[PDB]
Design a protein around this ligand. Structure first.
Ligand SMILES: Cn1c2c(c3ccccc31)C[C@@H]1C[C@H]2[C@H](O)CN1
Length: 282
């Protein structure tokens, strides 16, 4: 079926939970043996969210190459994304090592450091120009260059230096700051405006490594971001945009990381975002 009328048909019939459970039943199951090794317990935020072995990002280190991060490679859309958990106190150096090694231009953050009165990720970037951060375990330096605070999101320019080679690179930090502590946003308008700002920066384009996208677990809000982006790109590429099937795209993405889209409300919100976004594109 088309999307907008399939949408109204699920609303009128109140069957979002049944649609979402079907997706959960059909989703791929691949091994995640490296994630579950005892030496990696303090590298995982949640025991039930792990990268598959076949698609995990490897650190360029011979001691321990493990990080909770996955490469989502979308062949028809010609887009790739790295989805990862919010960094932990003992993985902030690994996080920036990955950004460096994978040649990423942008980092997309969809959570606040504290939500619901608890810490959802480490404070992993500097808050003042004159107070830079050094990650001694991976030999990197990170400096805040500029910050632009808007009503729904903040954009930061960061300088990442590999202290071993003295090479430097400019990284863009796109921080969506207004996702509610509970539920999903009422309107997709600010989320879509944010997606378009990331696109306009070059961070999603083939002349760079894959964008790094995270929330707390790296599957719910993060899944919504890449699902909406890929569906909108396919609607622009194909002769028949009504052939784009958001459930089929989500199942393709779940071949590369488990659990993408965590609730039926996130699934409905993803439909809403793609529907409204397709009208603005034209
Ligand atoms: C424009 N720019 C540059 C850097 C940078 C770091 C943060 C923000 C912007 C930046 C680092 C140096 C020179 C240039 C270049 O793009 C890369 N090498």
């Amino acid at each position: 079926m088309e999307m907008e009328k399939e949408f109204e048909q699920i609303d009128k019939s109140g069957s979002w939970a049944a649609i979402y459970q079907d997706i959960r039943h059909e989703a791929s199951d691949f091994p995640s043996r490296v994630a579950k090794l005892p030496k990696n317990k303090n590298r995982n935020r949640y025991r039930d969210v792990s990268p598959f072995d076949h698609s995990r990002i490897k650190l360029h280190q011979e001691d321990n190459d493990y990080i909770n991060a996955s490469l989502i490679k979308m062949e028809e859309a010609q887009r790739s994304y790295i989805l990862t958990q919010g960094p932990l106190p003992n993985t902030v150096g690994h996080f920036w090592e990955m950004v460096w090694e994978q040649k990423s231009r942008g980092v997309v953050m969809l959570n606040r450091v504290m939500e619901k009165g608890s810490l959802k990720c480490a404070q992993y970037w500097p808050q003042k120009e004159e107070k830079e951060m050094i990650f001694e375990d991976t030999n990197l330096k990170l400096t805040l260059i500029s910050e632009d605070i808007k009503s729904y999101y903040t954009v930061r320019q960061l300088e990442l230096e590999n202290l071993t080679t003295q090479e430097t690179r400019e990284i863009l930090h796109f921080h969506y700051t207004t996702w509610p502590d509970f539920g999903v946003p009422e309107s997709p308008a600010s989320f879509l405006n944010f997606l378009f700002k990331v696109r306009e920066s070059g961070s999603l384009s083939p002349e760079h490594g894959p964008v790094v996208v995270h929330c707390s677990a790296g599957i719910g809000r993060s899944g919504t971001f890449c699902l909406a982006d890929t569906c909108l790109l396919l609607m622009d590429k194909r002769k028949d945009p009504s052939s784009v099937d958001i459930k089929k795209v989500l199942l393709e993405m779940r071949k590369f990381r488990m659990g993408l889209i965590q609730t039926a409300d996130q699934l409905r919100f993803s439909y809403l975002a793609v529907i409204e976004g397709a009208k603005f594109i034209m």
